[PDB]
Amino acid sequence: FQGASMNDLISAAYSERLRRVCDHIERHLDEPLSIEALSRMAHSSPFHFHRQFTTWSGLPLYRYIQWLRLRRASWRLAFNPQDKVIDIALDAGFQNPESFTRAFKTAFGQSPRRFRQSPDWLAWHQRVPVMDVKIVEFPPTRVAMLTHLGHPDKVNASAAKFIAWRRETGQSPIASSQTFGIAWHDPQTTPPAQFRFDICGSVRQPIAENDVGVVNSEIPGGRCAVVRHQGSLDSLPESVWYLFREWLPASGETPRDFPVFFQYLNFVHEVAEHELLTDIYLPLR
Numbered sequence: 001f002q003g004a005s006m007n008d009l010i011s012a013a014y015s016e017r018l019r020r021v022c023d024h025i026e027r028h029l030d031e032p033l034s035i036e037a038l039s040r041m042a043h044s045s046p047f048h049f050h051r052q053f054t055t056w057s058g059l060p061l062y063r064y065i066q067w068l069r070l071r072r073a074s075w076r077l078a079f080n081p082q083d084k085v086i087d088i089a090l091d092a093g094f095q096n097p098e099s100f101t102r103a104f105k106t107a108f109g110q111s112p113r114r115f116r117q118s119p120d121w122l123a124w125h126q127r128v129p130v131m132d133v134k135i136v137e138f139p140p141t142r143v144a145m146l147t148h149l150g151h152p153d154k155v156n157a158s159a160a161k162f163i164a165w166r167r168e169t170g171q172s173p174i175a176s177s178q179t180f181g182i183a184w185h186d187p188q189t190t191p192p193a194q195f196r197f198d199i200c201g202s203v204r205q206p207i208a209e210n211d212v213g214v215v216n217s218e219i220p221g222g223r224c225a226v227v228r229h230q231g232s233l234d235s236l237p238e239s240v241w242y243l244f245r246e247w248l249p250a251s252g253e254t255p256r257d258f259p260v261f262f263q264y265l266n267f268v269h270e271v272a273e274h275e276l277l278t279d280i281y282l283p284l285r
Contacts, residue, residue: 024038077115165210224282225282236278255282256283
């Protein structure tokens with residue numbers, strides 16, 4: 001049908017209700033704005049008014065009022081040069097000119113005084129608007145490591161060997177040193193006959209030689225993507241998949257010739273699985 005639909009008519013009436021409310025706010029700024037009254041003016045519940053305004057305006061009432069006040073102060077900066085900046089900052093509801101300057105630099109992109117000097121209003125009109133992954137330069141670390149080649153489960157057993165070595169040789173990766181796991185392969189995709197996992201601990205000097213199989217090696221430094229994973233060692237492969245799916249296409253950076261490696265800032269069983277902290281590191285060239 002080409003005709004007007006009852007559904008669209010209702011949505012239009014609702015939107016224009018809330019537009020009436022917006023205009024009332026624009027008029028009655030700098031006033032005690034009782035949410036009960038504004039909620040009544042929208043023919044809606046006081047308990048749901050904020051979510052509706054956030055839904056449609058795109059920003060809550062406190063951000064909206066703040067940013068309208070900031071735009072008013074911007075007009076006053078550019079076109080009322082006689083007014084003092086402290087006075088303007090007080091008029092916009094800010095206690096200190098420093099905090100007003102903070103908010104201006106945060107939302108606008110220019111400092112207040114530079115705006116008073118050369119307003120770039122075009123930018124202002126264009127500036128109306130999950131997991132943190134970072135880029136760090138990992139320093140090359142001499143470590144002592146044991147390589148496991150076999151079934152992915154037996155890895156735990158081999159890890160025990162390393163722990164035993166730490167008690168026996170007096171080498172202390174426990175303190176003033178770090179403990180990493182070089183994850184060469186993904187156990188599901190990779191044949192468990194070739195699965196390689198390196199359990200390593202940081203050392204300040206070489207560890208001589210030992211019959212257990214622990215040997216000296218190094219983790220090279222340079223560009224490297226870091227993602228903070230919170231929880232189980234069984235949960236790490238999914239965040240590794242996250243890194244590969246999301247960071248590699250978007251970043252456009254190229255990985256270098258070293259396997260993925262995790263640094264356990266919180267060791268396994270000393271704290272709970274729910275509070276365990278691991279850092280996944282993707283080598284980047």
